[PDB]
Design a binder for this molecule. Sequence first.
Ligand SMILES: [Ga+3]
Length: 53
Amino acid sequence: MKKYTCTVCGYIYNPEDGDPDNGVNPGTDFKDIPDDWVCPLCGVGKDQFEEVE
Ligand SMILES: [Ga+3]
C-alpha cells in the first residue's frame, strides 16, 4: 500500500500505522479511509492529499 501526503502541511499517512486515535486502524488503504476524515495535523480533507510515488 502507498503512503499519501497532505499537500497543505506535509503530514504523511502511512497505511502500516493508520491513524488509530481517529478510528483508522493499521492496514487501512487511503482509499478506504472514511471520506470525512481530515489531516490530523492541519485539519484539511482527503482531497488535499496526494499519493507518494
Ligand atoms: Ga495536513
